[PDB]
Structure 1
Amino acid sequence: GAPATVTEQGEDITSKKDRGVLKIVKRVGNGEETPMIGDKVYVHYKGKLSNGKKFDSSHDRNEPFVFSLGKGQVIKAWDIGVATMKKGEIAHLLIKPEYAYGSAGSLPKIPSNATLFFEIELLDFKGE
């Protein structure tokens, strides 16, 4: 399974090297550039709780999923992880609770101390 590959082969992209965010590149992107803080990023994604049964996909939206990188618009793991991606890249991220919703959770949807998994495709990024 995809999560297991991340655990065994994924790169630790955390500053502290605590395995809180682990990454695998599933499809290589184009060019060289990865987005800076403040850039607007456009993604498709799907995500799940690693334990139990809750799944979320951007393909259910009627508009693109967009956020400004490094501005605290998403969980910490996404500001860390998307920053490492190239345009066109698809990545898997396995995320410990400290880089997501922590001991608090986001109840009832996200439990306390939830590990998360995401597949993310970086569609584009632009300066704001």
Structure 2
Amino acid sequence: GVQVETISPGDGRTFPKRGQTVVVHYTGMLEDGKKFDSSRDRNKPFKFMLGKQEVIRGWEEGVAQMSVGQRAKLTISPDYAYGATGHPGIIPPHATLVFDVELLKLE
């Protein structure tokens, strides 16, 4: 599944709702290992719409538990991420992923 560990609290009341655009900054790494991507490196937040199967399952479930302004560490098992095959060039097979995610706003 996905484990959410709070780094910095959000407002504790404003959570993503189905059909909203969720706006975040993140950095992703293999667990206790190497970084593979950061929205911060592009100076452009990442957006996705909740409820539209736009992201891996661990994101969908993990980010939904976050309130606006929260920063958290999401640890995502392979079956909640890229599973047995990974993703070419970026995620290996059977990989546990860790994302540092900051929920900036809901649009």
Distance 1:21 1:31, change over 3 A: closer
Q: CA deviation at 1:52?
A: 4.9
Aligned to 1:123: 104
Aligned to 1:93: 74
Aligned to 2:41: 60
Structure with the greater alpha carbon radius of gyration: 1
- In structure 1, the residue corresponding to 2:58 is in which secondary structure? helix
Correspondence 1:71 to 2:69:
no
Structure 2: runs of 5+ lacking an equivalent? none
* Contact 2:2/2:58 (<8 A) preserved: yes
* Contact 1:51/1:115 (<8 A) preserved: no
> Which structure's relative contact order is higher, taking Cα pairs within 8 Å and 6+ residues apart?
2
Instruction: Write the deviation string for residues 58-80 of structure 1: whole angstroms up to 9, x where unpaired.
Output: 11114321110121111111110
Instruction: Write the deviation string for residues 68-124 of structure 1: whole angstroms up to 9, x where unpaired.
Output: 012111111111011111110001111100000000111232111000001100000
Aligned to 2:25: 44
- In structure 2, the residue corresponding to 1:60 is in which secondary structure? helix
Between 108-117 and 48-57, report the one with greater CA deviation: 48-57
Aligned residues between the structures: 107
Instruction: Write the deviation string for residues 32-71 of structure 1: whole angstroms up to 9, x where unpaired.
Output: 1201111101001111012653431111114321110121
Please list, as runs of the form range in 1=range in 2, the aligned pairs for 1:15-34 lying within 5 A after superposition: 20-34=1-15
Percent of paired sites with the same residue: 50
Greater strand proportion: 2
Task: Provide TM-score, normalisation by structure 1.
Answer: 0.77
